Amino acid sequence: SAKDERAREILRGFKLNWMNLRDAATGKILWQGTEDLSVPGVEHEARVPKKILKCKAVSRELNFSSTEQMEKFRLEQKVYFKGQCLEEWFFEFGFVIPNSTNTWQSLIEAAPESQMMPASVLTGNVIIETKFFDDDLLVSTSRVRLFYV
Ligand SMILES: Cc1c(Cl)cccc1NC(=O)CCCn1nc(C)c2c(C)n(-c3ccccc3)nc2c1=O
């Protein structure tokens, strides 16, 4: 399949260089990471301060590079608590220039039901599954276990 291999080429040339999380209201940093969490197969770990749970919302910034051109680069994310899906998030970036590096800012809001759970119950039991697409085409699937510390 040309589709599978195209997806593979995109992945070989892609990485996430860093990300941030800010309080969306003040703009102050909460957490930042430098490991490439695009990487599938490994369960990644993220130890994020629990004050992030006391946020109406979070601003997130991803810096990534891609050798491959992408037509409509986007993300589907689902957040799981003990295998139960709490959130279902979508983000489009769009067209990506080949061999570019890009910063991308997204607003991240949780549902009330999510907000009704404490760090003590969430910590270690949350997994963000991140699906990276170009349009209709799955490039990579990574997962991150979160601790609220
Ligand atoms: C999740 C949540 C609950 Cl359950 C209740 C109340 C608020 C929240 N919101 C958060 O925890 C905000 C953190 C959002 N967040 N945290 C991390 C660690 C993220 C990572 C690693 N990613 C990410 C993963 C793979 C590739 C790109 C970004 N997105 C994240 C991401 O969107």
Numbering used by the authors: 2 to 150
What's in the article?
Herein, we describe the discovery of pyrazolopyridazinones as a novel PDEδ inhibitor chemotype that targets the prenyl-binding pocket of PDEδ with low nanomolar affinity. To identify alternative chemotypes for the inhibition of the PDEδ/Ras interaction with potency similar to Deltarasin (KD=38±16 nM), an in-house library of ∼150,000 compounds, assembled considering structural diversity of the underlying scaffolds, drug-likeness, coverage of different established drug target classes and inspiration by natural products, was subjected to high-throughput screening by means of the previously developed AlphaScreen Technology13. The screen revealed pyrazolopyridazinone 2a (KD=5±2 nM) as ligand of the prenyl-binding pocket of PDEδ. Structure-based development of the pyrazolopyridazinone hit class was enabled by a crystal structure of inhibitor 2a in complex with PDEδ at a resolution of 2.6 Å which revealed that, like inhibitors of the Deltarasin-type, heterocycle 2a employs H-bonds to Tyr 149 and Arg 61 for binding to PDEδ13. Initial screening and molecular modelling investigations (Schrödinger, Maestro suite) revealed that a C-3 linker between the two hydrogen-bonding groups is important and that shortening of the linker would abrogate H-bond formation between the amide carbonyl and Tyr 149. Therefore, a C-3 linker was kept for further inhibitor development. Since anilides display low metabolic stability, we searched for an alternative to the anilide embodied in hit compound 2a. Initial investigations and modelling revealed benzyl- and homobenzylamides as potential inhibitors, since they could adopt a conformation in which an H-bond with Tyr 149 is formed and the empty space in the PDEδ pocket is filled. Based on the fact that pyrazolopyridazinone 2a binds to PDEδ like the Deltarasin-type inhibitors, molecular modelling experiments indicated that 2k will form the same hydrogen bonds as Deltarasin and may additionally form a hydrogen bond with glutamine 78. Herein, we compared the newly developed PDEδ inhibitor Deltazinone 1 based on the pyrazolopyridazinone scaffold to the benzimidazole-based Deltarasin and the genetic knockdown of PDEδ.
